[PDB]
């Protein structure tokens, strides 16, 4: 059914049990929360932050489960959304490689489940929409996986403004260079290669898979797609939320 | 390489050898030529004519190989085109069942070949374009597989006008009913079931496969498709030729 991915080393926590543990989490103002739907840019965005700095709390929770401490102590929250199609496809190939995960079966089979939101991490729909609703009320930066690919400088530009932090021009690119998909894929300290293949086999699918927006186009039949649109446009009626693909 | 499909019982004739044999074919005016690219509505259109009447010459030849006799004797030529995507998909699943045919291999592999026109029956592109250029110079009725599905009455309406022939309203629908895909599929006299499975196995793919326009959408990845369009738009620059899909 429905749990959530966590990381002492990647594993499944029952959302509730996990929420009970975090329920009354206390937050120092300097703390920096980073939230994302799974396979929506996390490991990437993280290393972008970790770069900018060198306390970062990584959380795949929906907005309505963030410990109030954070709201109260107006913590800086970076949030990253990624278009659903790509997020779906990335998340699919993931189930198809991570042993921790349930069997994805067919790609048509997975879809039905994904749109129903009946997959590890809740509904991507409910997830992204909550956060967007929150960007109105909180110290949240809302970023889009695609816009980063589009303009890494133009994006990190923003992050800095948000953090009051101010880097070099060389130190700047030093970051951009590393947080390119090419460099990061060949990087054992992020690429999750240095892992049990019983846990994650890259010979099936590598965590750092393709990392191109628009890749979904390589898997979604013109039918499955025109299906995805109709179902999407429904769940997103009213939303001011908008994606490049 | 490149031959053509014929029918004492369906078989491969080397296009040239076959054209040499037909080169100086003599044509009585009353004769009715029906031409089509393969898997573009032939067996359907045939039975429509056979119906309307009960001499019909069935030919899968390109316009520039029709024996001049026919031109000279201004014969009535019904021509049927079917949109390429569908035509491709239909023709693909066909190779994948008809033993007479070469191996289609992958569906991506087949595509390359189809667009290159390097498949049994020549280039669908060169085929339909020639016939369209001819509709300007000859007693040719140019029909579209899709328009038929769209409005069989509204289509057969035309055929009659073209033939001067004039049927009943009941005799009319009697025809429409039979030349529906549903009726025809369960019909041994057209459905090619009554055949050697060494020649054609329906347990793989039935000649009367789906018979819905828009079916291709069930096979062509949003990439393969956006690929097909770009390549198509090229070969069809200038053409006034146009398809529903
Ligand atoms: N530096 C980078 N630039 C672009 N995409 C990256 C990246 N690092 C990781 N990704 C992509 O992030 C996705 C996993 O997201 P998360 O970090 O949220 O689990 C993968 O998508 P693909 O599966 O499309 O390749 C991966 O390729
Ligand atoms: N009465 C009918 N109405 C619609 N389509 C028909 C039909 N009879 C045959 N077809 C379709 O004609 C195609 C074969 O064409 P041809 O007669 O030129 O070989 C098949 O397409 P599919 O493979 O898309 O099902 C078949 O389904």
Numbering used by the authors:
A (entry chain A), B (entry chain B): 18 to 71, 112 to 302
Paper text:
Cytosolic sulfotransferases (SULTs) comprise a family of enzymes that catalyze the transfer of a sulfonate group from 3′-phosphoadenosine 5′-phosphosulfate (PAPS) to an acceptor group of the substrate. In doing so, SULTs modulate the activities of a large array of small endogenous and foreign chemicals, including drugs, toxic compounds, steroid hormones, and neurotransmitters. The crystal structures of SULT1C3 bound to PAP, apo SULT1C2, a ternary complex of SULT1C2 bound to PAP, and the environmental toxin, pentachlorophenol (PCP), and SULT4A1 were solved at 3.2, 2.0, 1.8, and 2.2 Å, respectively.
Substrates for SULT1C3 have not been reported previously. Our data indicate that this recently identified member of the hSULT family is able to sulfonate p-nitrophenol, 1-naphthol, 2-ethylphenol, 2-n-propylphenol, and 2-sec-butylphenol, as well as the steroid-related compounds, α-zearalenol and lithocholic acid. SULT1C3 appeared to be most active with α-zearalenol (4.1 nmol/min/mg) and 2-ethylphenol (2.2 nmol/min/mg). These data suggest SULT1C3 may contribute to the metabolism of steroid and phenolic compounds. We have identified a number of novel substrates, inhibitors, and compounds that bind to these SULTs in the absence of PAP. These data combined with activity assays revealed that SULT1C3 can bind catecholamines and phenolic compounds, but only the latter are substrates. However, a closer inspection of the structures also suggests that binding of substrates may not be completely uncoupled from binding of the cofactor. In all the structures with the co-factor product, PAP, α14-α15, and the C-terminal segment of the largest flexible loop (green in Figure 2) are ordered.
